[PDB]
Ligand binder design. Sequence first.
Ligand SMILES: OC[C@H]1NC[C@@H](O)[C@@H](O[C@H]2O[C@H](CO)[C@@H](O)[C@H](O)[C@H]2O)[C@@H]1O
Length: 345
Amino acid sequence: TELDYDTFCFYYDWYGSEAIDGQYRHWAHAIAPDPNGGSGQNPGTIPGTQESIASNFYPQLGRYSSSDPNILTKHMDMFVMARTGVLALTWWNEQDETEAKRIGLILDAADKKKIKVCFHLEPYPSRNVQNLRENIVKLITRYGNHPAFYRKDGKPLFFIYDSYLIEPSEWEKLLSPGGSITIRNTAYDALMIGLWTSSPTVQRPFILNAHFDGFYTYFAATGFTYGSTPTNWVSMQKWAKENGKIFIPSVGPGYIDTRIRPWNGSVIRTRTDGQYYDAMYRKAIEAGVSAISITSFNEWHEGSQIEPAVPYTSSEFTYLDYENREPDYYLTRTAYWVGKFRESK
Ligand SMILES: OC[C@H]1NC[C@@H](O)[C@@H](O[C@H]2O[C@H](CO)[C@@H](O)[C@H](O)[C@H]2O)[C@@H]1O
Protein backbone atom coordinates (compact mmCIF):
# COMPACT_ATOMS: atom_id res chain seq x y z
CA THR A 1 0.00 0.00 0.00
CA GLU A 2 2.80 2.43 0.91
CA LEU A 3 4.00 4.56 -2.04
CA ASP A 4 7.68 4.31 -2.88
CA TYR A 5 9.41 7.72 -2.84
CA ASP A 6 12.54 6.51 -4.61
CA THR A 7 10.55 5.37 -7.63
CA PHE A 8 10.11 8.04 -10.31
CA CYS A 9 7.61 7.69 -13.13
CA PHE A 10 8.04 9.94 -16.22
CA TYR A 11 4.83 11.90 -16.80
CA TYR A 12 3.70 13.95 -19.80
CA ASP A 13 1.25 16.87 -19.38
CA TRP A 14 1.08 17.87 -23.05
CA TYR A 15 -2.18 16.13 -24.13
CA GLY A 16 -5.19 18.21 -25.17
CA SER A 17 -8.87 17.83 -26.03
CA GLU A 18 -11.08 19.96 -28.27
CA ALA A 19 -13.47 20.45 -25.32
CA ILE A 20 -10.83 21.83 -22.94
CA ASP A 21 -7.88 22.97 -25.05
CA GLY A 22 -9.62 23.75 -28.34
CA GLN A 23 -7.56 21.06 -30.13
CA TYR A 24 -6.43 17.43 -29.68
CA ARG A 25 -2.86 18.42 -28.83
CA HIS A 26 -0.26 15.63 -29.06
CA TRP A 27 -2.93 13.06 -30.07
CA ALA A 28 -2.38 14.99 -33.32
CA HIS A 29 1.34 15.03 -34.12
CA ALA A 30 3.81 15.57 -36.94
CA ILE A 31 5.30 12.45 -38.47
CA ALA A 32 9.09 12.64 -38.21
CA PRO A 33 11.33 12.75 -41.30
CA ASP A 34 13.79 9.88 -41.75
CA PRO A 35 17.23 11.13 -40.54
CA ASN A 36 18.87 9.06 -43.28
CA GLY A 37 16.16 9.88 -45.82
CA GLY A 38 16.39 12.33 -48.71
CA SER A 39 16.35 16.12 -48.61
CA GLY A 40 12.77 17.13 -49.50
CA GLN A 41 10.73 14.66 -47.45
CA ASN A 42 7.05 15.23 -46.83
CA PRO A 43 6.22 12.81 -43.99
CA GLY A 44 2.81 14.31 -43.12
CA THR A 45 0.88 14.48 -39.85
CA ILE A 46 -1.44 12.40 -37.69
CA PRO A 47 -4.76 14.25 -37.23
CA GLY A 48 -5.62 13.15 -33.65
CA THR A 49 -9.12 12.03 -34.63
CA GLN A 50 -10.71 9.11 -32.73
CA GLU A 51 -9.63 6.78 -35.57
CA SER A 52 -6.08 8.11 -35.88
CA ILE A 53 -3.88 9.15 -32.94
CA ALA A 54 -0.13 9.55 -32.57
CA SER A 55 0.40 6.25 -30.72
CA ASN A 56 0.69 2.58 -31.57
CA PHE A 57 -1.53 1.90 -28.53
CA TYR A 58 -4.85 3.48 -27.50
CA PRO A 59 -5.62 4.96 -24.04
CA GLN A 60 -8.52 3.62 -22.00
CA LEU A 61 -9.24 7.23 -21.11
CA GLY A 62 -9.40 8.21 -24.81
CA ARG A 63 -7.96 11.43 -26.25
CA TYR A 64 -7.75 13.17 -22.92
CA SER A 65 -6.72 16.65 -21.83
CA SER A 66 -3.84 16.85 -19.37
CA SER A 67 -5.75 19.82 -17.81
CA ASP A 68 -8.99 17.91 -17.14
CA PRO A 69 -9.43 17.69 -13.33
CA ASN A 70 -11.25 14.36 -13.81
CA ILE A 71 -8.31 12.94 -15.76
CA LEU A 72 -5.87 14.20 -13.12
CA THR A 73 -7.79 12.43 -10.29
CA LYS A 74 -7.78 9.22 -12.36
CA HIS A 75 -4.03 9.41 -13.08
CA MET A 76 -3.25 10.00 -9.39
CA ASP A 77 -5.31 6.92 -8.42
CA MET A 78 -3.28 5.01 -11.05
CA PHE A 79 -0.01 6.17 -9.42
CA VAL A 80 -1.35 4.84 -6.08
CA MET A 81 -2.21 1.55 -7.81
CA ALA A 82 1.33 1.35 -9.19
CA ARG A 83 2.91 2.28 -5.76
CA THR A 84 4.97 4.93 -7.62
CA GLY A 85 5.49 7.80 -5.17
CA VAL A 86 7.05 10.40 -7.50
CA LEU A 87 5.72 11.85 -10.71
CA ALA A 88 8.59 13.22 -12.87
CA LEU A 89 6.96 15.99 -14.86
CA THR A 90 8.13 16.88 -18.38
CA TRP A 91 9.08 20.56 -18.46
CA TRP A 92 9.54 22.62 -21.63
CA ASN A 93 9.81 26.24 -20.42
CA GLU A 94 6.62 27.28 -22.23
CA GLN A 95 6.48 30.37 -20.09
CA ASP A 96 2.82 31.06 -20.65
CA GLU A 97 0.39 31.23 -17.83
CA THR A 98 -1.27 28.08 -19.10
CA GLU A 99 1.83 26.09 -18.19
CA ALA A 100 1.74 27.53 -14.67
CA LYS A 101 -1.97 26.70 -14.24
CA ARG A 102 -1.38 23.11 -15.42
CA ILE A 103 1.58 22.50 -13.07
CA GLY A 104 -0.55 23.91 -10.25
CA LEU A 105 -3.37 21.50 -11.10
CA ILE A 106 -0.95 18.51 -11.14
CA LEU A 107 0.63 19.41 -7.78
CA ASP A 108 -2.82 19.82 -6.13
CA ALA A 109 -4.06 16.50 -7.52
CA ALA A 110 -0.84 14.66 -6.55
CA ASP A 111 -0.94 15.91 -2.96
CA LYS A 112 -4.47 14.53 -2.41
CA LYS A 113 -2.98 11.04 -2.78
CA LYS A 114 0.41 11.91 -1.21
CA ILE A 115 2.19 11.69 -4.58
CA LYS A 116 5.26 13.96 -4.93
CA VAL A 117 6.33 15.86 -8.09
CA CYS A 118 9.81 16.60 -9.41
CA PHE A 119 10.77 18.18 -12.75
CA HIS A 120 12.20 16.56 -15.86
CA LEU A 121 14.07 19.38 -17.57
CA GLU A 122 13.79 18.91 -21.32
CA PRO A 123 16.03 20.34 -24.12
CA TYR A 124 13.82 23.39 -24.45
CA PRO A 125 14.76 26.02 -27.10
CA SER A 126 18.09 27.81 -26.36
CA ARG A 127 18.55 25.86 -23.11
CA ASN A 128 21.93 26.76 -21.54
CA VAL A 129 23.37 26.89 -18.00
CA GLN A 130 22.42 30.53 -17.39
CA ASN A 131 18.71 30.14 -18.26
CA LEU A 132 18.66 26.70 -16.63
CA ARG A 133 19.81 28.40 -13.40
CA GLU A 134 17.11 31.08 -13.87
CA ASN A 135 14.51 28.34 -14.36
CA ILE A 136 15.59 26.19 -11.43
CA VAL A 137 15.33 29.34 -9.30
CA LYS A 138 11.85 30.12 -10.65
CA LEU A 139 10.63 26.52 -10.11
CA ILE A 140 11.94 26.28 -6.53
CA THR A 141 10.61 29.78 -5.73
CA ARG A 142 7.18 29.12 -7.22
CA TYR A 143 6.57 25.49 -6.21
CA GLY A 144 9.17 24.65 -3.54
CA ASN A 145 6.67 25.27 -0.71
CA HIS A 146 3.93 23.13 -2.23
CA PRO A 147 3.31 20.01 -0.08
CA ALA A 148 3.65 17.76 -3.14
CA PHE A 149 7.04 19.22 -4.18
CA TYR A 150 9.60 16.43 -4.10
CA ARG A 151 12.66 16.56 -1.83
CA LYS A 152 15.21 13.87 -1.01
CA ASP A 153 16.82 14.48 2.43
CA GLY A 154 15.90 18.19 2.07
CA LYS A 155 17.03 18.52 -1.56
CA PRO A 156 14.93 19.10 -4.69
CA LEU A 157 15.76 16.73 -7.56
CA PHE A 158 15.83 17.47 -11.29
CA PHE A 159 16.28 15.00 -14.16
CA ILE A 160 18.11 16.64 -17.07
CA TYR A 161 17.19 15.12 -20.40
CA ASP A 162 19.82 15.09 -23.18
CA SER A 163 22.29 16.72 -20.77
CA TYR A 164 25.11 15.91 -23.24
CA LEU A 165 23.91 18.83 -25.42
CA ILE A 166 25.67 21.10 -22.88
CA GLU A 167 29.42 20.55 -22.42
CA PRO A 168 30.91 19.70 -18.99
CA SER A 169 32.84 23.03 -19.07
CA GLU A 170 29.41 24.72 -19.07
CA TRP A 171 27.90 22.36 -16.45
CA GLU A 172 30.77 23.04 -14.07
CA LYS A 173 29.82 26.75 -13.93
CA LEU A 174 26.46 25.71 -12.49
CA LEU A 175 27.29 22.50 -10.63
CA SER A 176 30.85 22.75 -9.28
CA PRO A 177 31.13 24.10 -5.73
CA GLY A 178 33.51 26.76 -7.15
CA GLY A 179 31.39 27.33 -10.28
CA SER A 180 30.97 30.93 -11.50
CA ILE A 181 27.15 30.72 -11.27
CA THR A 182 26.98 27.81 -8.82
CA ILE A 183 23.83 26.56 -7.13
CA ARG A 184 25.91 24.52 -4.66
CA ASN A 185 25.49 25.62 -1.06
CA THR A 186 22.80 28.12 -2.12
CA ALA A 187 19.04 28.21 -1.40
CA TYR A 188 18.70 26.66 -4.91
CA ASP A 189 20.92 23.63 -4.57
CA ALA A 190 19.36 20.42 -5.88
CA LEU A 191 20.20 16.87 -6.85
CA MET A 192 20.98 17.07 -10.55
CA ILE A 193 20.54 13.82 -12.42
CA GLY A 194 22.16 13.73 -15.87
CA LEU A 195 21.53 11.36 -18.75
CA TRP A 196 24.04 8.52 -19.17
CA THR A 197 24.05 7.48 -22.84
CA SER A 198 27.18 5.84 -24.28
CA SER A 199 30.28 3.92 -23.12
CA PRO A 200 31.99 4.45 -19.70
CA THR A 201 35.02 5.98 -21.47
CA VAL A 202 32.87 8.96 -22.49
CA GLN A 203 30.24 8.96 -19.74
CA ARG A 204 32.46 8.57 -16.69
CA PRO A 205 34.47 11.79 -17.22
CA PHE A 206 31.28 13.54 -18.44
CA ILE A 207 29.47 12.92 -15.16
CA LEU A 208 32.52 13.74 -12.98
CA ASN A 209 33.56 16.89 -14.91
CA ALA A 210 29.98 18.12 -15.16
CA HIS A 211 29.48 17.66 -11.38
CA PHE A 212 26.13 15.86 -11.64
CA ASP A 213 24.96 14.27 -8.40
CA GLY A 214 23.73 11.26 -10.36
CA PHE A 215 22.67 9.73 -13.64
CA TYR A 216 19.72 7.97 -15.29
CA THR A 217 19.40 6.10 -18.57
CA TYR A 218 15.87 7.00 -19.73
CA PHE A 219 15.44 4.69 -22.77
CA ALA A 220 12.81 1.96 -22.41
CA ALA A 221 14.30 0.01 -25.33
CA THR A 222 16.99 -2.44 -24.15
CA GLY A 223 20.21 -2.14 -26.12
CA PHE A 224 19.37 1.26 -27.67
CA THR A 225 22.32 2.73 -25.76
CA TYR A 226 25.06 1.39 -23.51
CA GLY A 227 23.16 2.86 -20.55
CA SER A 228 19.88 1.19 -21.53
CA THR A 229 21.55 -2.27 -21.74
CA PRO A 230 20.59 -3.80 -18.36
CA THR A 231 23.56 -6.19 -18.22
CA ASN A 232 25.74 -3.09 -17.76
CA TRP A 233 23.82 -1.95 -14.70
CA VAL A 234 25.77 -3.81 -12.01
CA SER A 235 29.06 -2.26 -13.26
CA MET A 236 27.43 1.18 -13.61
CA GLN A 237 26.16 0.94 -10.01
CA LYS A 238 29.62 -0.06 -8.74
CA TRP A 239 31.17 3.01 -10.44
CA ALA A 240 28.37 5.23 -9.06
CA LYS A 241 28.99 3.94 -5.56
CA GLU A 242 32.80 4.40 -5.92
CA ASN A 243 32.34 8.02 -6.99
CA GLY A 244 29.51 9.11 -4.67
CA LYS A 245 26.97 9.37 -7.52
CA ILE A 246 23.27 8.37 -7.46
CA PHE A 247 22.39 5.83 -10.19
CA ILE A 248 18.69 5.76 -11.21
CA PRO A 249 18.32 3.19 -13.98
CA SER A 250 15.22 3.49 -16.18
CA VAL A 251 12.97 0.49 -16.81
CA GLY A 252 10.05 0.25 -19.25
CA PRO A 253 7.40 -2.29 -20.36
CA GLY A 254 8.30 -2.07 -24.06
CA TYR A 255 8.87 0.42 -26.91
CA ILE A 256 7.33 1.28 -30.28
CA ASP A 257 7.12 4.68 -31.96
CA THR A 258 6.47 3.75 -35.59
CA ARG A 259 3.26 5.78 -35.95
CA ILE A 260 5.32 8.97 -35.53
CA ARG A 261 8.67 7.51 -36.62
CA PRO A 262 7.84 4.92 -39.33
CA TRP A 263 11.55 4.46 -40.15
CA ASN A 264 12.40 3.54 -36.54
CA GLY A 265 11.31 -0.12 -36.49
CA SER A 266 14.64 -1.53 -35.27
CA VAL A 267 13.99 0.10 -31.86
CA ILE A 268 10.74 -1.88 -31.38
CA ARG A 269 10.63 -4.03 -28.24
CA THR A 270 7.53 -6.21 -27.85
CA ARG A 271 5.86 -6.43 -24.42
CA THR A 272 5.44 -10.25 -24.70
CA ASP A 273 2.57 -10.23 -22.15
CA GLY A 274 4.65 -8.55 -19.46
CA GLN A 275 7.81 -10.66 -19.86
CA TYR A 276 9.87 -7.76 -21.20
CA TYR A 277 8.88 -5.54 -18.25
CA ASP A 278 9.59 -8.30 -15.71
CA ALA A 279 13.07 -8.95 -17.12
CA MET A 280 14.02 -5.25 -17.12
CA TYR A 281 12.67 -4.36 -13.65
CA ARG A 282 14.34 -7.48 -12.20
CA LYS A 283 17.71 -6.37 -13.63
CA ALA A 284 17.36 -2.94 -11.93
CA ILE A 285 16.56 -4.57 -8.58
CA GLU A 286 19.45 -7.02 -8.95
CA ALA A 287 21.90 -4.14 -9.62
CA GLY A 288 21.28 -3.03 -6.01
CA VAL A 289 20.44 0.58 -6.92
CA SER A 290 18.96 3.03 -4.44
CA ALA A 291 16.32 4.40 -6.84
CA ILE A 292 14.50 3.40 -10.01
CA SER A 293 12.88 5.41 -12.79
CA ILE A 294 10.01 4.18 -15.00
CA THR A 295 9.77 5.14 -18.65
CA SER A 296 6.97 5.90 -18.75
CA PHE A 297 3.59 6.67 -17.25
CA ASN A 298 2.14 8.11 -20.49
CA GLU A 299 4.62 8.67 -23.28
CA TRP A 300 1.99 7.31 -25.70
CA HIS A 301 4.01 8.32 -28.81
CA GLU A 302 6.81 5.94 -27.87
CA GLY A 303 4.68 3.02 -26.66
CA SER A 304 6.52 2.94 -23.30
CA GLN A 305 3.39 3.79 -21.24
CA ILE A 306 2.13 1.80 -18.20
CA GLU A 307 -1.09 3.81 -18.29
CA PRO A 308 -4.09 1.52 -19.16
CA ALA A 309 -4.64 0.90 -22.88
CA VAL A 310 -7.62 -0.79 -24.64
CA PRO A 311 -7.95 -2.90 -27.80
CA TYR A 312 -9.14 -0.73 -30.73
CA THR A 313 -9.17 -1.04 -34.52
CA SER A 314 -10.13 1.70 -36.99
CA SER A 315 -10.09 2.21 -40.77
CA GLU A 316 -6.88 4.14 -40.08
CA PHE A 317 -4.95 1.69 -37.93
CA THR A 318 -4.97 -1.55 -35.95
CA TYR A 319 -3.75 -0.49 -32.50
CA LEU A 320 -1.61 -2.73 -30.36
CA ASP A 321 -2.95 -3.55 -26.92
CA TYR A 322 -1.96 -5.42 -23.75
CA GLU A 323 -2.65 -8.83 -25.37
CA ASN A 324 -3.50 -11.53 -22.75
CA ARG A 325 -3.51 -8.93 -19.93
CA GLU A 326 -6.12 -6.50 -18.59
CA PRO A 327 -5.79 -2.75 -19.35
CA ASP A 328 -4.52 -2.09 -15.78
CA TYR A 329 -1.92 -4.90 -15.77
CA TYR A 330 1.21 -2.72 -16.12
CA LEU A 331 0.03 -0.63 -13.14
CA THR A 332 -0.50 -3.62 -10.85
CA ARG A 333 2.67 -5.31 -12.14
CA THR A 334 4.58 -2.11 -11.38
CA ALA A 335 3.20 -2.35 -7.81
CA TYR A 336 4.53 -5.94 -7.70
CA TRP A 337 8.08 -4.88 -8.63
CA VAL A 338 8.02 -1.83 -6.35
CA GLY A 339 7.27 -4.27 -3.45
CA LYS A 340 10.24 -6.41 -4.49
CA PHE A 341 12.49 -3.35 -4.80
CA ARG A 342 11.49 -2.23 -1.27
CA GLU A 343 12.20 -5.62 0.30
CA SER A 344 15.84 -5.63 -0.80
CA LYS A 345 16.55 -1.88 -1.08
O1 LIG B 1 11.16 13.22 -21.73
C1 LIG B 1 12.35 12.88 -22.47
C2 LIG B 1 12.01 12.58 -23.92
N1 LIG B 1 11.10 11.44 -23.99
C3 LIG B 1 10.79 10.93 -25.31
C4 LIG B 1 10.10 12.06 -26.06
O2 LIG B 1 8.92 12.37 -25.30
C5 LIG B 1 11.01 13.30 -26.10
O3 LIG B 1 10.35 14.39 -26.77
C6 LIG B 1 10.54 14.27 -28.20
O4 LIG B 1 9.70 13.29 -28.82
C7 LIG B 1 8.30 13.48 -28.66
C8 LIG B 1 7.51 12.32 -29.28
O5 LIG B 1 7.83 11.09 -28.66
C9 LIG B 1 7.89 14.81 -29.29
O6 LIG B 1 6.54 15.08 -29.03
C10 LIG B 1 8.72 15.92 -28.67
O7 LIG B 1 8.40 17.14 -29.29
C11 LIG B 1 10.21 15.64 -28.81
O8 LIG B 1 10.91 16.64 -28.11
C12 LIG B 1 11.40 13.76 -24.69
O9 LIG B 1 12.31 14.88 -24.77
